[PDB]
């Protein structure tokens, strides 16, 4: 669990450690301690359910780019764990959810 600190009003950027080999289709899960996880992005290009237009992912165009999730205008309520479920073409079925990161807030 890698920690990462963000101050108020800034723009946060979270990247998962696993790197894809081919066509990727990632899912970004937000899990608050004690509550059920909330799905943010499912097809790496669009948000699954209506949420504030603050979380954005990178599309899968011109293979060679990493997978990053950006959050503009972060508030105090954005304190939860982030899971980067990776799905590629040269690895088969993916069972592990990957190593989660710990977002900390300054102020």
């Amino acid at each position, epitope marked *: 669990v890698r920690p990462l600190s963000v101050a108020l009003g800034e723009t946060a950027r979270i990247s998962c450690g696993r790197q894809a080999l081919g066509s990727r*289709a990632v899912q970004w899960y937000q899990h608050r301690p004690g509550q059920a*996880p909330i*799905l943010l992005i499912y097809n790496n290009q669009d948000r*699954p*359910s209506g949420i504030p237009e603050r979380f954005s992912g990178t599309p899968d165009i011109n293979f060679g780019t990493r997978a990053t999730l950006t959050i503009s205008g972060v508030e105090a309520g954005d304190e939860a764990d982030y899971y980067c479920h990776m799905w590629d073409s040269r690895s088969g079925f993916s*069972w592990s959810f990957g190593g989660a990161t710990r977002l900390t807030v300054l102020g």
Partner: nanobody, 132 residues
Framework: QVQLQESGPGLVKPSETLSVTCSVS????????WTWIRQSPGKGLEWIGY???????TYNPSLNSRVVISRDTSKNQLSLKLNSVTPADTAVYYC??????????????????????????WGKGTTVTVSS
């Protein structure tokens, strides 16, 4: 809209069967997949298995296949039973639904595509403990 509820005993003696039930209200079992996921304190999330209308109980290869999941449409619920429980298996369980999609990257007649699953609706889950 879909509503999901969960139920479990909570206190089970080790080396016995641990059964947890998950019921659905509002919608039927027409086109809704099901899946279970456990989370133990100190470790991350762990996907254990999923089931659908195909009776294909596919389990995690890192689990020794010691759990069975069933779903009866008469009572309109599913339930998972893990046999030979270990006292070190104290974890919170969640019953969720899954949505399947396909990603295509080449010619379809040759089979150049792959399926993926995404959980959209979740539940509160039960916290069960096992001790002597």
């Amino acid at each position: 809209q879909v509503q999901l509820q969960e139920s479990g005993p909570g206190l089970v003696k080790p080396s016995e069967t641990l059964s947890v039930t998950c019921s659905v209200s509002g919608d039927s079992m027409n086109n809704y997949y099901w899946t279970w996921i456990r989370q133990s304190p100190g470790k991350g999330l762990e996907w254990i298995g999923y089931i659908s209308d195909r009776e294909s109980a596919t389990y995690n290869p890192s689990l020794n296949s010691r759990v069975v999941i069933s779903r009866d449409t008469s009572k309109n619920q599913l339930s998972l039973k893990l046999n030979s429980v270990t006292p070190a298996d104290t974890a919170v369980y969640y019953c969720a639904t899954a949505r399947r999609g396909q990603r295509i990257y080449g010619v379809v007649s040759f089979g150049e595509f792959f399926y993926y699953y995404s959980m959209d609706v979740w539940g509160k889950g039960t916290t069960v403990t096992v001790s002597s």
